[PDB]
Design a binder for this molecule. Sequence first.
Ligand SMILES: *Cc1c(COP(=O)(O)O)cnc(C)c1O
Ligand SMILES: *Cc1c(COP(=O)(O)O)cnc(C)c1O
Ligand SMILES: *Cc1c(COP(=O)(O)O)cnc(C)c1O
Ligand SMILES: *Cc1c(COP(=O)(O)O)cnc(C)c1O
Ligand SMILES: *Cc1c(COP(=O)(O)O)cnc(C)c1O
Ligand SMILES: *Cc1c(COP(=O)(O)O)cnc(C)c1O
Lengths: 280, 282, 280, 282, 287, 287
Amino acid sequence: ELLVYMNGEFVPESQAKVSVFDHGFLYGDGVFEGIRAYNGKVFKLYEHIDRLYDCARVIDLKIPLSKEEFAEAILETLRRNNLRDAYIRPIVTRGAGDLGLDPRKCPSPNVIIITKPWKGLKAITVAIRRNAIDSLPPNIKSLNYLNNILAKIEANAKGGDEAIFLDHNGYISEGSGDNIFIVKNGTITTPPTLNNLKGITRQVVIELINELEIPFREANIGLFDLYSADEIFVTGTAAEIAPVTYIDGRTVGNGKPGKVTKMLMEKFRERTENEGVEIY
Amino acid sequence: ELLVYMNGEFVPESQAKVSVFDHGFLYGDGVFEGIRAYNGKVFKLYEHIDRLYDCARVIDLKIPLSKEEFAEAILETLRRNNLRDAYIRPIVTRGAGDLGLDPRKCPSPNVIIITKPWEKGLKAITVAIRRNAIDSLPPNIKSLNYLNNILAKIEANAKGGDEAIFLDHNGYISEGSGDNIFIVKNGTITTPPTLNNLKGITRQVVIELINELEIPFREANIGLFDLYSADEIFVTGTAAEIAPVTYIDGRTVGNGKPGKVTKMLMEKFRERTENEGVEIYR
Amino acid sequence: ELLVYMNGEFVPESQAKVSVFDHGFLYGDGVFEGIRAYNGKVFKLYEHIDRLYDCARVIDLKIPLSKEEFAEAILETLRRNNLRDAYIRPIVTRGAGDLGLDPRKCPSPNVIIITKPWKGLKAITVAIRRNAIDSLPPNIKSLNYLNNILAKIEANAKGGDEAIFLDHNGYISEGSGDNIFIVKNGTITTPPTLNNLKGITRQVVIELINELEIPFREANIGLFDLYSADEIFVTGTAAEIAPVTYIDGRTVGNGKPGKVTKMLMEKFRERTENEGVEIY
Amino acid sequence: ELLVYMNGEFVPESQAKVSVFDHGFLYGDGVFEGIRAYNGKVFKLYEHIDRLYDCARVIDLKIPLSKEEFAEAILETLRRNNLRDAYIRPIVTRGAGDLGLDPRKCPSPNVIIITKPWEKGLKAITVAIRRNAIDSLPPNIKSLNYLNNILAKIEANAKGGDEAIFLDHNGYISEGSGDNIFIVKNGTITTPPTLNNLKGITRQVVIELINELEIPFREANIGLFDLYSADEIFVTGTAAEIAPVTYIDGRTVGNGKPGKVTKMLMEKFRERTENEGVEIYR
Amino acid sequence: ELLVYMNGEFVPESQAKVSVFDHGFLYGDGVFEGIRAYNGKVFKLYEHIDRLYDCARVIDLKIPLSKEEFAEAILETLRRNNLRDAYIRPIVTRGAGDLGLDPRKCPSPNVIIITKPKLYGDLYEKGLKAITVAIRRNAIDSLPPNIKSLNYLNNILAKIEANAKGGDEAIFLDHNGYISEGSGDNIFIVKNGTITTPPTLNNLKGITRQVVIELINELEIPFREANIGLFDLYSADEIFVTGTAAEIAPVTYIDGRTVGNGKPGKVTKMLMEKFRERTENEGVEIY
Amino acid sequence: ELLVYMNGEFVPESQAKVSVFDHGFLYGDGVFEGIRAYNGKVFKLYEHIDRLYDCARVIDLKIPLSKEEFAEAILETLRRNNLRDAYIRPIVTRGAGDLGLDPRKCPSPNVIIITKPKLYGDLYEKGLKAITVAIRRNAIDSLPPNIKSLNYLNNILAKIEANAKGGDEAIFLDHNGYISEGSGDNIFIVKNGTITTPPTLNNLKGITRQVVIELINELEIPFREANIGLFDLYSADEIFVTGTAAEIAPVTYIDGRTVGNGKPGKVTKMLMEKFRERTENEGVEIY
Ligand SMILES: *Cc1c(COP(=O)(O)O)cnc(C)c1O
Ligand SMILES: *Cc1c(COP(=O)(O)O)cnc(C)c1O
Ligand SMILES: *Cc1c(COP(=O)(O)O)cnc(C)c1O
Ligand SMILES: *Cc1c(COP(=O)(O)O)cnc(C)c1O
Ligand SMILES: *Cc1c(COP(=O)(O)O)cnc(C)c1O
Ligand SMILES: *Cc1c(COP(=O)(O)O)cnc(C)c1O
């Protein structure tokens, strides 16, 4: 049985439980990460940690471990589970307090680390818009994911593998759990991150694009751009690079993964084979 | 030790815990209520349950109890704890599934019920952060995604406020971080339409009291100009009841003491909580 | 073969054609109506005419017939086709001018009248928003219907019989071609018309609701209201009252037409049997 | 008499007519282009066709000609009319179907090609009506729904303007009613990003000329403040080419005469239309 | 020479000047009113004063006079100039401070009251030609339009558009595309015998507007306070605007378009006559 | 007593007054500048003048002085008061007209120049405590924030919030939720060694801001002009604001939250020192 890190103890999965009084559970008042181990090494471990700490700062939550201790803890929980290929979900919550909202009454944050062993998508645009930048900033990878879940429920009902959000301005934002890229006449465009999330996989992809010297723009786009694109793909830690071959039932290109997307998938695979922090 | 209802079992508080795999924890993927018991009667029990079932429907969650069984579970939890004056927090979550978002992989929801035992105004401040928008995370869902509200509270804590007041994206007043808002100006009471806030049970009772008293009343969008020129402000909710707001953004509301109308509504509300409700021990 | 009214001539359907230089065709620069004849009488003929003329005024288009002459023309084209149960599509365009946009160069509007013989809907909310009140006012029943068509294309791809628009504020607007009503705990709500279209069928329905003394509100609503509604229906000249029994795959009530909706359908049917202008 | 291309036939202008059942007429359900021929060569023929096919794809319309065949049809229509200096208007519509909206009932699109034979600035005015929004009726589609643009022109006609200037809902400058917009301020040229307007072929040529001349250039959102303080303004499009704007909202732009930079771009553009294009008679 | 009230002193017009350091001047940091005297009586004097004090409260400015003392000051300045028919402009400013924004550094508000002695033209025959402006009304959460403040550049910019674009009157929309008001007057429309006017939130809670609604309800004309848009303006049977200085002004053309027959409408004309009657029959006696 | 330039005359401060009928006073209808003299030299004098003339053009106001005559007037008013270190406030107003809004009825603008003799405190140690305000910045299509106008009540309202809410400095968002600026200073952030500042569209095209970007590019610090939001502010390593009066001011706390260690950051401190050097080495000689 896999062990979960809970505040420094390793607890079997079936017994890994949090107080119902934890503000993480009552109010989604916490932050989280998603990280992959490939063949014994943790891909972009430090970058993910840095984002976690930034998100914690945004919600005014003090993580009770230094960054190095957090990295050790992630590594120790993979070893304890004897994992080499894994998805890792670190979570930091506000902890318990009074029953109300007030985070000043919550003296002890809680730290959890879950480790689990490890043709394109039909995407649909959803009616629901992404969380606004001045209500629930979407750059926060928080435990408030019901915006994302409502979009997923739409896609499930409407013939889609993946939901695509616009923002309130009508700009394309992202998928429900992944950043979005388009290819047109050989130029790649992706939205600026402000209205979506500063994806680590997106950042790797951009480095690859610039190394391949493929023309690239970070620019807001709309429905006209999605429906006229030669290729679409989405990016994220779990999905990696995933081709999107239909959009609202419309065929993208010939309906199979495009040339630029398949090229980047191969380069991305190479980076995951060659980089990372050693677990053992 | 108080006991927590958990899927039909009564569990000591200290051991009342949920799987870290529950999407309620992972994603705030659930709904909740807040209910008061006053001297052995639950106030507005059925209006709370009905709202819970509406919010669950909006997030496409089937609660695995009939409404009648939910009512019985709440009353039984109160009884097991010997409570007569209490605050009650029902929660329903999506339960566990895959580690990803998709609620279709979540076969079994969790039902939890927490019971706890139970003139100067509030100083309010308006916050920079806007209310969750009606086409992103509709504020009418009393869900476990409460970081909008907590972000507002963090502002109020830093800015000298007991209560944070939200605007929406249009610039319309919305509500407090956990309470609806009313103003009084030249004998007329105005409160925002519920669309950009939440359909409060307390707010509804108060409208009823207003209409009994024949005080002129409007449900209409308002802005900062209205807050800053009001004769009285108050907020409403299950825990706070009716709470006068005596300062706004450091500005004195009337004479800084609770206003004539607010006080009259406070008295009438107290009478309702004394005289109506569902009896726990019967 | 059915005849079409074209500027006072009656022209067989197969030869009923408009100059490609008509600004109606080049730029959708015209207005239109939809009207039903039931058993020899034209339902709300004068109301539809009045709306046509209001829409023409909004686009600064002078209709070259008085209102009475327009009514005569509609009646004459139904008689000429010997119709008793019909859909009528009157259309007024800018006419031809210079090839550019300028309506001042277009001296002669064109008047066309088409007459054709005559479980709920699964509705889906669409990603595209309704035309804005200060860009292309949706109260104009104009020949610019591509907003409406793009929504229809979404619904067709996404498992829907009917598309439902929000506006830019997130408020519910209407269906792609019909007004929307909801029923909850016995109260009926419909949006104010500003962000949709002042439907004649909607107006009849409201009169019926007030005669049945059913609690009613004209109030903006959102997704929360649609997904928690006991009943939904849409209204329009062609559709009449149409029950909506699914919304984004979610069951409305028991998945069959609700009690209040079926009651109004029966009352509406009675009004169409008893009112109208006689054709013969 | 000039002939119009209509689904492969060449029809005298006076008899070139489409079914009143065509959704192009009923609902403006189609796309169009605008193209110039200069001294027996078509300027930017392929960039126009490519845009037509993009706009058709966005409205989910399959044009029943390959791009190469469309190019041949345009050139043949010009030849049949003996034209050398011309304005060309290709149109593709959805064709006829049911009388209702649904494009699935429309089996056969219509292809039409119209050919016509072919220093003081414009007075511009800003209009009240905003540009069609990017998530309602995306302005980048050169569709037959042009009433947004005609409403603007009606304003300009009533308000003393040769050209109407749109803002978008954010308050950003968008474009003219049928032309893109550029400003010049202290030696730098700025033009809006295309998202809230239309990806003009003329605008693209002009950016190329700007970059050849090494004049500092920005693609950036601008507002009224920028228009009202500009040293020069000009608009661009196939019919107008580069048109100086010498007044804005009655305010004089520079000295009221076309500006130094605008004039230099006008000369360079004229050279391109003289020297590049697809030959009609070859 | 007319006298201007200036903090209790009465100063000839030509000498009535304020320090260049008054934040009223530097920053538009103050509030104002517009009130009319008709035939020796001040119309809605106490209502205008109540609004002044609310606007002041909104900008966190304490007016150093009781409401009753302000009413006496207005009446006194009228008497000292011997006026029977007049327009009155009370102004309260923040006063002088440091050069910076901060109102805490400003100890002493200035109170000024200007008093000055109807538009030429047969308003039963000839209305205003209105244009809708590109600029939008100041937003309810940036510079709330309900404040009758010295910040009137939004309003002046709209007037400049109108001046340039062949209008006598500028009409604002708000950011939502809802009709707001004219540059200085609330707006009403009439359609199929029903009168509509926007809620006041996006414009200003006009006292003339309020009087007109009272007259409307007396006449039993169907009435709606609702948001409206361009479609409503362009299809209206009648349009008029309202405010203290101009009273009820018909709008007979909008953005080119003829309203009705291009003359003031029947409803408008009836309201104009009733309003003028109202101004003869009510008011606070100056003498 | 210091003298104030007033349409060519030099008037002692205490006598420097403007008519209550000047539309500058009634309506905030005018434009201004803020310029500093350091050690006998005026810093970016011609740039400030160019901005004044652009703001005037935006509000359709013709300044009745050539740019060169305006430069001489500023220099002259400094010399007449014998200043070496000073803050200069040129103002141009619409002038007097009729009582109404209409700027056509206003024949004669007023030109005023105020000249007055650094914030107390170790700015290498102690920064500003900033709060984000509920009120949004004036919108780009209602009252364009790029205009340095006499309509500063949006800015004063934000300051009032800050005063009440424990801030030294108010920070505005715009209607889109993008960070705009402080109430009177542009804003910069620093994160992982990259500096970001908003495009000027939703705020004001600051001259201090422009100087700072020049210094940044000299230092080869990575730099982005991009929109940003609350997430960016709350996670920034450093924050500072910029403007003529305050120069470069570190912001060490935002809405409760400690920025870095609560002291001015390394990048900020380097820019402050370089900026001060710049102000010693450039400028138009007064004498
Ligand atoms: C985690 C996440 C992403 C992608 O981030 P990576 O760092 O590539 O895994 C994108 N969007 C949302 C909403 C997410 O939660
Ligand atoms: C629960 C709640 C309310 C008010 O609810 P009552 O039903 O009166 O307890 C108001 N606003 C928010 C955000 C809430 O969560
Ligand atoms: C015609 C129309 C309606 C309904 O109008 P009726 O007068 O009931 O037929 C609603 N919405 C749209 C978009 C329409 O075109
Ligand atoms: C066609 C068009 C343009 C400019 O196009 P060119 O391709 O340069 O002819 C600009 N705006 C609108 C609205 C248009 O229809
Ligand atoms: C004063 C004013 C009005 C009209 O108010 P009255 O009280 O009727 O004089 C309307 N709009 C604006 C902007 C105003 O300043
Ligand atoms: C003057 C001003 C600035 C700063 O500009 P500087 O030219 O650097 O003095 C920034 N914001 C506002 C609102 C201002 O008035």
